[PDB]
Ligand binder design. Structure first.
Ligand SMILES: NC(=O)c1ccc[n+]([C@@H]2O[C@H](COP(=O)([O-])OP(=O)(O)OC[C@H]3O[C@@H](n4cnc5c(N)ncnc54)[C@H](O)[C@@H]3O)[C@@H](O)[C@H]2O)c1
Ligand SMILES: [K+]
Ligand SMILES: [K+]
Ligand SMILES: [K+]
Ligand SMILES: [K+]
Ligand SMILES: [Mg+2]
Ligand SMILES: [Mg+2]
Ligand SMILES: [Mg+2]
Ligand SMILES: [Mg+2]
Ligand SMILES: [Mg+2]
Ligand SMILES: [Mg+2]
Ligand SMILES: [Mg+2]
Ligand SMILES: [Mg+2]
Ligand SMILES: [Mg+2]
Ligand SMILES: [Mg+2]
Ligand SMILES: [Mg+2]
Ligand SMILES: [Mg+2]
Ligand SMILES: [Mg+2]
Ligand SMILES: [Mg+2]
Ligand SMILES: [Mg+2]
Ligand SMILES: [Mg+2]
Ligand SMILES: [Mg+2]
Ligand SMILES: [Mg+2]
Ligand SMILES: [Mg+2]
Ligand SMILES: [Mg+2]
Ligand SMILES: [Mg+2]
Ligand SMILES: [Mg+2]
Ligand SMILES: [Mg+2]
Ligand SMILES: [Mg+2]
Ligand SMILES: [Mg+2]
Lengths: 71, 171
RNA sequence: ACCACGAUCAAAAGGGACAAGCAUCAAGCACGCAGCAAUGCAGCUCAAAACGCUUAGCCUAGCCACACCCCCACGGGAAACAGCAGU
RNA sequence: AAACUCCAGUUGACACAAAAUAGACUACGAAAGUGGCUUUAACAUAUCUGAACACACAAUAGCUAAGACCCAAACUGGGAUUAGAUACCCCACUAUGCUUAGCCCUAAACCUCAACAGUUAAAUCAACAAAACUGCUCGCCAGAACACUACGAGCCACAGCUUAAAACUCAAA
């Protein structure tokens, strides 16, 4: 069999890797922004739980951790 | 482990083995053999201790004992060879095979299943109902949901006393 | 007619059954049980699809739902043809 | 041509590198892999099937930290070729290949042929390839391209991996 199907995928992958390399500083700023909104969306979900259960503040001694940071 | 002076399983029932020279007793003991000879002695001790017929090796009881001795030898090997991935696989597979054996023994002969668990020191466990990753988001939310439940239970009890106290004042 | 310890018809309540698409909705977060109570136990649902989003009146001798909107209608917004004819 | 010229040849001393011949053998291991020597430990299961995600593994490249360094060698530099030569050819040298401790989780990871049980008779069978079938089970597929992509989610991964669409387009592929 010829490799024409492979060649189409080969060029797709080459152009994608080159695009990512050319815009890696913009994508890094976008990724940072998404992880922040992701952390906020997670904090809202936990706050919805204790508010709907009748509590006015988080359980005593609870601190929502940052589960999406590199550290 | 059996004492090093223990005779091999093959020379333990030969007539007159107690009257030979001390040198001959060393050459026929576990001290002068490989670890596999010591495991055959361990297996024999468990059989007489547990199974009803120590000569039947094809019963589900003898197989669980034989495999339990292999499992212990793999654990001892890995205590020294912690990067030996091949034997780590053999250990985990053997533990799975023993659990399947114990499941089949528990279903068919419970009285024998209890003696095996006691004799070998096995704590039987039932498998989990679901197999799914407990990632960070889930682990965190589950811990928060348990705290919220614990706090709501305290507030519901403090709403019983106040209602009870006010009710007594009317009298 | 009236009682019918009855029949017929048929609510509320209890049990069971009951649409489609998406799993890139995979966990739900109190959803259980015991006890006369006090209270105790920590359980309950879920890849055999819970929880969720989206679409749609349906299984048509007909049935369900709605009746300007706020699911409801004390109250409020407000002043009502989704009755017929008509604009 | 550049390069070296404390260079070259013989002789002696001399590895944290790599393992002629055997091998015309076809073995071991779940796969990846495994072919110098010795020893220790050691290669699951007395029905089968059973997972992108559970559990444990997984060539090469790559990341983090500390070491070793013969040789090889991305990159880079020099020489040459050429219309040009960011290549192919020559030289030098680095990351890297090694060890230790952690990661990363990919392959034409393909013998592109799922596991188990059974058959060689019937219709033997599109073509080619490695003859054609039966039972049973799990996984997967439903025009091409968009797409090993976007978004969401998970992940020690932050130019990553896994899962993975749609719109616009064509009447073919
Ligand atoms: N999800 C479960 O943990 C679970 C529980 C009981 C039975 N099963 C059986 O597993 C099979 C696969 O189910 P699916 O199509 O929903 O899975 P899937 O492949 O869509 O995976 C969904 C989830 O189930 C897990 N899973 C996948 N294969 C599994 C298997 N063989 N056994 C157990 N867990 C598995 C995955 O890790 C993931 O967490 C079915 O035969 C189902 O009956 C699965
Ligand atoms: K209404
Ligand atoms: K060799
Ligand atoms: K692959
Ligand atoms: K191949
Ligand atoms: Mg060809
Ligand atoms: Mg393309
Ligand atoms: Mg009713
Ligand atoms: Mg699934
Ligand atoms: Mg999406
Ligand atoms: Mg539903
Ligand atoms: Mg509608
Ligand atoms: Mg109107
Ligand atoms: Mg109304
Ligand atoms: Mg009208
Ligand atoms: Mg050879
Ligand atoms: Mg199996
Ligand atoms: Mg699956
Ligand atoms: Mg994979
Ligand atoms: Mg690897
Ligand atoms: Mg490396
Ligand atoms: Mg060199
Ligand atoms: Mg180097
Ligand atoms: Mg070496
Ligand atoms: Mg290979
Ligand atoms: Mg299979
Ligand atoms: Mg297609
Ligand atoms: Mg790829
Ligand atoms: Mg991707
Ligand atoms: Mg993404």
């Amino acid at each position: 069999k010829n490799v024409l199907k492979i060649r189409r995928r080969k060029m797709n992958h080459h152009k994608y890797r080159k695009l990512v390399k050319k815009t890696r500083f913009l994508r890094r700023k976008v990724q940072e922004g998404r992880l922040r909104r992701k952390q906020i969306k997670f904090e809202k979900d936990l706050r919805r739980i204790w508010l709907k259960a009748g509590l006015k503040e988080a359980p005593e001694g609870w601190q929502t951790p940052k589960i999406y940071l590199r550290g | 482990d059996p004492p090093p002076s223990t005779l091999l399983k093959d020379y333990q029932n030969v007539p007159g083995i107690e009257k030979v020279d001390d040198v001959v007793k060393r050459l026929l003991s576990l001290e002068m053999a490989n670890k596999k000879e010591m495991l055959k002695i361990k297996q024999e001790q468990f059989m007489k201790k547990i199974v009803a017929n120590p000569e039947d090796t094809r019963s589900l009881e003898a197989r669980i004992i034989a495999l339990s001795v292999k499992i212990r030898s793999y654990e001892e090997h890995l205590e020294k060879h912690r990067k030996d991935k091949a034997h780590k696989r053999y250990l985990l597979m053997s533990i799975d095979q023993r659990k399947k054996m114990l499941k089949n023994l528990r279903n068919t002969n419970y009285d024998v299943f209890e003696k095996i668990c006691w004799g070998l020191g096995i704590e039987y466990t039932f498998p989990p109902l679901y197999y799914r990753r407990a990632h960070r988001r889930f682990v965190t939310k589950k811990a928060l949901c348990i705290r919220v439940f614990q706090e709501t239970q305290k507030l519901k009890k403090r709403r019983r006393a106040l209602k009870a106290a006010a009710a007594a004042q009317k009298q």
